[PDB]
C-alpha cells in the first residue's frame, strides 16, 4: 500500500507519505515518529501527483512546506 515519502528530508518530524488504494493514490501529511496524520488528499494517478506538485511555488523544502500547508489546509 505504501509507495514512498514525497520529500527526502524531514522538516521537524513531518513528511508527506504517498499511498495506494487501487485506481487512485492518497497523499497524506503525517508525523513520522508517532504515525498519526494531519489531513489528507486523494489523487487519481501519480502523474497528477507530480504534475500538481512540481507546479508549486518553491524549490527544495520550501515546496514541501507549501505542500504541507496545502494538504493540511483548514477545509472550511
Amino acid at each position: 500500500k505504501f509507495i514512498k515519502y514525497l520529500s527526502t528530508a524531514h522538516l521537524n518530524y513531518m513528511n508527506i507519505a504517498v499511498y495506494e488504494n487501487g485506481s487512485k493514490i492518497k497523499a497524506r501529511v503525517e508525523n513520522v515518529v508517532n504515525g498519526k496524520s494531519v489531513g489528507a488528499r486523494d489523487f487519481d494517478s501519480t502523474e497528477q501527483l507530480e504534475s500538481w506538485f512540481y507546479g508549486l511555488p518553491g524549490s527544495g523544502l520550501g515546496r514541501i512546506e507549501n505542500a504541507m500547508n496545502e494538504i493540511s489546509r483548514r477545509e472550511n
Partner: protein
Amino acid sequence: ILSTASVLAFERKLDPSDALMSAGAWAQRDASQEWPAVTVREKSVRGTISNRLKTKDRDPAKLDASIQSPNLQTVDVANLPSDADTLKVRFTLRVLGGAGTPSACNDAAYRDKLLQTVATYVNDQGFAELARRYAHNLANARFLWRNRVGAEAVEVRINHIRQGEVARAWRFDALAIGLRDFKADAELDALAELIASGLSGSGHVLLEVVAFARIGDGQEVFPSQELILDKGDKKGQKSKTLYSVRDAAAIHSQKIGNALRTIDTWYPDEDGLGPIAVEPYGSVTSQGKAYRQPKQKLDFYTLLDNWVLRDEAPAVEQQHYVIANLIRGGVFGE
C-alpha cells in the same frame, strides 16, 4: 515486574563549542594569537544545465531553449587572504562525567537497576577504551571535515586548563596518525588517562584544541552551511548561506561533536569501511544506509533492554557501544 521507564533522558557529556577559523602564515605559527578572521562574502555565479533529464520530454530544441534561459545565482564563499596559506581552527571542550545518571525517569527500581548495571561496567573495566578512541579522534583532524582533504601538513595542539594557566600541552601530527588504524602511543595514553579521569568524575577537565592546516595562498575554506528554504517568494534569494559569528566564519558545535564520537568499528555488516559515528539504529545520512538494524539483535534499544531488565550481558565491544550511547545522551523511552 520490571517494565522499561516511559520517560528517559540523558544529558550529553563531551560538550564542544563553536570552532572559529582565522587565517595566517605558516612558521608564524607559534604567535597565532593576533591572526585576522576568515570572513564570509558574496559572489555571483551563472550556472547551466547539467542535471539528469527525464525520458518523457527531452527534445533538442527544448535543451537549446533551456540554454537560452540559464540560472543566475548568488552564493557565499569564504577564502583565505592572498598572502596566507594556513587555516587555524580553535574550539574548547568540557568533559563532564557522571555518565550513568539520567535527568528524567519515571520508575525508581529501573533507575537503581540501571545505576547498578553502569557501576558494574565501570568497576569491571574502566573508561580506557572509549577515552583511547576519543583521544585518537582528537589526535588527528576529524573535526576538519573537508579542510583536511588535500593538505600539506596538519598540526594539532591540545592544552589542559586548570586556572588562568596551562597545566600540560600536547603537540601532535595529524597526517602521521592514521585515519582508520587506532594504534597506541605514549602521549595518547597520557591524554586518554586525562579524558578517562574526566568521564569517571574524578576531576574537572577543560581542553583547548587548536588545529593548523597548510592549504595554499588564497584557497577556499569550508565553514558549515545554514538552512534556507525558497518558497517561490520575492527577489530570487541566495541559495547558499554560511554559518558565522560576529564577523568570522565558523563550524557548528554538533558537527565537531559528530566528529569526536566516531567510535563504532563493530558493525555486523562490514568492518572494512571504517568507524562511523555512534547512533541508535546506527545510521549514515550521507550514504543513505542504516547499519545495525532492529531486525538483528545489535540495536541500542535491544541491547539495553536485554542487559538491564534480563541480566543478559552482551559481548564486551557491544557494552562499549551501549556506554558510548550513554555518553552521547539523548531522549530515550516511549
